[PDB]
Structures are given as C-alpha cells and as structure tokens.
Amino acid sequence: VPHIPRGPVMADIAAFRLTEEEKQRLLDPAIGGIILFRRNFQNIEQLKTLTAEIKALRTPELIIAVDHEGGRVQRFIEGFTRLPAMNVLGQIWDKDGASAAETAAGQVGRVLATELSACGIDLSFTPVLDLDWGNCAVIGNRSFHRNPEAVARLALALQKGLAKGGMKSCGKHFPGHGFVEGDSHLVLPEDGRSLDELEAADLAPFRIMSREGMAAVMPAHVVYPQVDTKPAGFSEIWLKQILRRDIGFKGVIFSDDLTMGIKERARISFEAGCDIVLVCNRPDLVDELRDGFTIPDNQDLAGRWQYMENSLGHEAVQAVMQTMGFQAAQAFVAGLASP
Amino acid sequence: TVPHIPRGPVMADIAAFRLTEEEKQRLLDPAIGGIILFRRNFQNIEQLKTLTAEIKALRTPELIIAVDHEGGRVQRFIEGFTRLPAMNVLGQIWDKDGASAAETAAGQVGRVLATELSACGIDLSFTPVLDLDWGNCAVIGNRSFHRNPEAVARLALALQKGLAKGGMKSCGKHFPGHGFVEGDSHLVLPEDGRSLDELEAADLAPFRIMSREGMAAVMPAHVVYPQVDTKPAGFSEIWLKQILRRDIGFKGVIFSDDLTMEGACGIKERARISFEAGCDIVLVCNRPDLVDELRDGFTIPDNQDLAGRWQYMENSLGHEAVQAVMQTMGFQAAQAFVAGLAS
C-alpha cells in the first residue's frame, strides 16, 4: 500500500463503489480527502465497504467527510437516526431554557458523530455558526438562533457531543453568512456592515469555538466590502489577518466548493490562507487541477489533516452503540426530529 | 411627450435608490419590458414611490416592476412594511387548526403582502412557492407551505385570492418542483432523479391547479430531471412546451432561469436558448453590462402573446385607491394579524 502524504485537495466520487478511474484519481498526491453525498449512499453495509476501499488505497488514509448538519442537510437517511434541524435546538433554548437546549445539543452531536464513525467517516462539516438574522434562505433553519450567545453555547455543546462520537468540529461559514440574502438568484450579494458590527455579533461564535478547540473552519462565499473587496475565502485579510493572527485559530481552513479556470481559483484560495480546497461534483475539474499541480508549501498541512482523523476505533464504537445510554440518546434525538 | 414602445422580452434591474441617466437610457431600449427590485434599491417608502414613479414615467405601456416578497427570509423591503411570516407558518396552521383557519390566514397574508407593495408602485411579487416540503431542500426550507400537495395547492389558491385583493397576480415557483432535491450549496445545479409519473402524482399538482385558477406567471427550477430531459427545466422544450404549455395548458408568462453558462462565467446565446426552450421573458440581474451587450443589435423574437402576458401582470389598483384602503380598520386589522404570525 503506497505511502503518500495527504495532499491539499478534497475531491468526491460518483456512486456507491469506487471505479478503477476513481481509484487512480484518489492515488494522486494532490488529493488528501473525500467528501461524500447522498448519491454515494445505498445502505449501511455498502457505505462501510465504500469507506474501507477508500481507506485501503494509501497511507496516511484519505480523510472522509460528509455534510450531516441535521434537518434538510443530512445525506444518509436509511439506517441512521433522523437528526433535527439546528434551529430546533434554538427553539428548545427559547422555550425550556439554555440548560435543556445545551443538553439536547450534546446528545444530537453524540448521535450524529457516533453513527457516522461506525461507517468509517472521519468528520461532519458541522456546526453552522451563522446567525439567524431572518435574511438568508440558503442558511435558513440550519442556523441555531439569532442570538450570538445562544449560537456559541449550542455549538460548544454540540462540539462536545461530536467529540464523544470521535469527531472534531468544522465551523461555518466564516466570518458569518447569516446577514446576506441568499435565495433564488445565483449572485452573492455583499454584506455591507462594518467590522465592529461583525465583532459584536457574527464573529463571536467563531472566536469562542476557536478558543475551545474547533478543528476546522469553512469560509463564506460572501464579500464584506468595508473589510475587503474579495470574498472571505479568497481574502488574506479575513483568513490570515483576522482568523489566524487576531483570533489565533490554528486548525484547518477549508475552501468552500470551488466549482461555482480551476487552477487559478485554487491558487488564490491557497494564497489567501486555505489549507485545503474542495472540488465537488466535477471529477473533470479535479483531473484538470491535479495535472501538473504544484503542492503549495504548507508545513502545517500534515498535522492539520491528522487532527481531523476519527478518534474512535471500530471496536470502541461498536461497544458504545450497545450501551443503554447511547440507545436512549438515539431515541431522544429521533424524537426531536419528529412531531 | 412620453414614447410609446412595446414591452420587450427582457427584465433587467437597477443599481441603487434612484435611476441614473445611464439606467434611464437603458430602460428606454425596446428589448426591455420590466424591472426587478432588490433590497439594495430600498431606503424608505417615500424613496421607493419616487423610484417606481420615475421608472413608470419613461415609457408606455409602463415597465412592469416586480420584487421577491414571499415572507420570512425572503422579503426585500422591511422598514415601513408589515413583516411577513414564512409560508410554512400557514402550513402549521393547517396541521393545528385545520384547513379553514389556514386558508383564511393565507388570504390575509396575501392581501397585506400585495397591498403594501401596490401602494409603492410595484406590480407583482414573485410568490407563491409551490415546491413541496419533502424534508430535503434547505434553500427552500420554510418557504414551502407543506409536504402535502393538497395543502400546498389550497394554501396557494387562498394566498392568490388575497394577492388579487391587493391588486396583484401570482407567480408560481419553481416549476416543475424544487422540493425533492438537496440544496445547501448556493451555486450548485441539483439533480432530481425521479420519473415524470412520480412528479405528476405530487410536485406538479399545485402547478396544474394554480394554472387552471389563473396563475399569471411561472418561474422554472434551476434543476435537471434526467428521466425527462438532460437540460435544466428553464432550458428544456420538453418541460416548458410539451409539459407546461400543451399538457397543463398554461397560458401565462414563463420567466427564465437567470443562469450565466460556463462559457461566459455570451449572453446573446444564453438568451436565445431560453427563448427557444419556451421562456417569454428573460431575467438578467446584477449585470447591467450583460444587459447592454444583449440589447445592442437585439432582435426581439416574434411572440404575439407577449404584450397580453405582460399586461395581465399590471397592478389592478390605482395609487390613491390603495392609500385609502390602507387607512381602513379592516386593512389595519389584517396588518396586525399578519405581523402577529411573523412574531
């Protein structure tokens, strides 16, 4: 089994099992991980086979991720506990108070991560830390709450739950996607607010999560003209000056999906301060990108990938899932997802 | 005097709070028939009335002005307007208090939504969403009335009656149904793998019913349905001519999917394929440069139905008549009721 460092590109796969073409593509040194989607899921046993064959190609093993946020963002349904939307936890905060909501968030995190860990997944791209300003449909009910304190505290509780399931957290979408409108038209409108306004609200959950060991951040494809004319994901000011130096974040900075040529788009992401670029739904663009690709010099990259590897072994996870307390967490979380 | 020019097949937009001279010249072009407004075009009620008046004064028939006021997280104009609830609130009323209470509530939401916009010189809101809440699509999310096509159809019809009291027609979206796909990445073209039979049993039914009952316009989904066509709905003859025009019998406006192709990241070709697929009117937003490129030497495609399709959407209520209705106790009670749903 070839020993190749994990490269700075996260790619994806077409269907339920790897094809030979996909195997050769995943051997490229540009690639360090894979993101899975609903089209990659048939059942639990197929999924375990898929993640095993991805893992068997090379060492260090390719990091595997998925979007399991809850509600209308949960790729794998059949055989998993149905997860509630994150705004349901914010509704519990308003109705039954902070303590009940935090406890609920902890259980959602635990269930979410553990069930994925059992299938060979390393990481879910969660939580959303965007604030519910009542402006952005594409975020919508994926946001915990309007109030930065509720978001911060619900996210921290979810994070602790994720860690019990073996996973780190990935906060999104830095520095805050909640204020802009985002619905039926495909252009990214500006967020015209000042840095002071963002520090008072949208940035606070990111600061707090960073301090408490958040492993990864994904930037917003949003321009904040009072801070920089570039979108956050392509901005040295946002990613190096604000996120790295001022906030002190030491983890992975993912790019969002750069499909939206690709070589230049990836270059500007890396120059801005992203560690890893995501290229989804477009194996052609991954092939274009990797051909003659120069891996940017990033001495921190290997450790940043390895921090995201799942912390639970296969047997350890099978043991936790037989416990009465985990089975009770499952039933509790399932109940939050139904009326 | 004020020039008499037919409304063209392009809907464009504007940069800020008042027209610039360049925008005025652009809006005189015979390629243009209407304007879509966004939050960036809104400062206050009085500025908005001035903006719509100056747009209207350029030519006759007056340019059609539209906006996205759905409710909840899709409401462009906030300050001085009643805050509108998300459409799923009406579906929650359906589940809890029954169809009659929900329909009555939908009628009031429609009335408030349309009347307040009509007062500002707006012709049309791009509402309602007829997408079904399959529990799959975040970008639709709470903008859908309900999971069940019957509830969606009936809530939409009641909203439509409300809209008409405020002077407006309706625009159903996103044909043939955006509810089943996942949609949490802004720029991605989702794939809905279902058969036409599956869509006829559910997602298409609200569109059929709204069409029969006088829906004025449809906006297509930026979604590929591979079992029916390899092209997205807004670029598909099968979806727009075969299914929507001939099978369903829809006679209103088909707006375009405003999509810049991998070629352009030009516009003349993109507009051409939209018209060839069956769109009446193409939207070009946030890119006055592409509107300028498009209109220069533009040949207006021959569409004998276009003039009447635009005119059906013109607001039915006069400016003074609306200012009078808004002072009535029954309208002010509608406002407070709708505001309460949004809390």
Swiss-Prot record, chain B:
Q: Where does substrate bind?
A: D68, R76, R143, K173, H174
Between which residues do disulfide bridges form? none
Q: Which Pfam families match?
A: Glyco_hydro_3 (PF00933)
In alphabetical order, the GO MF annotations are: beta-N-acetylhexosaminidase activity
State the GO CC annotations: cytoplasm
- Annotated catalysed reactions: Hydrolysis of terminal non-reducing N-acetyl-D-hexosamine residues in N-acetyl-beta-D-hexosaminides
Query: What is the recorded name of this protein?
Result: Beta-hexosaminidase
| Role noted for this protein | Plays a role in peptidoglycan recycling by cleaving the terminal beta-1,4-linked N-acetylglucosamine (GlcNAc) from peptide-linked peptidoglycan fragments, giving rise to free GlcNAc, anhydro-N-acetylmuramic acid and anhydro-N-acetylmuramic acid-linked peptides.
Keyword annotations from UniProtKB, A to Z: Cell cycle, Cell division, Cell shape, Cell wall biogenesis/degradation, Cytoplasm, Glycosidase, Hydrolase, Peptidoglycan synthesis
* UniProt-annotated site: Important for catalytic activity, residues: D184
**Entry annotation: catalytic residues:** H186 (proton donor/acceptor), D257 (nucleophile)
InterPro entries in alphabetical order: Beta_hexosaminidase_bac, Glyco_hydro_3_AS, Glyco_hydro_3_N, Glyco_hydro_3_N_sf, Glycoside_hydrolase_SF, NagZ_Beta-hexosaminidase
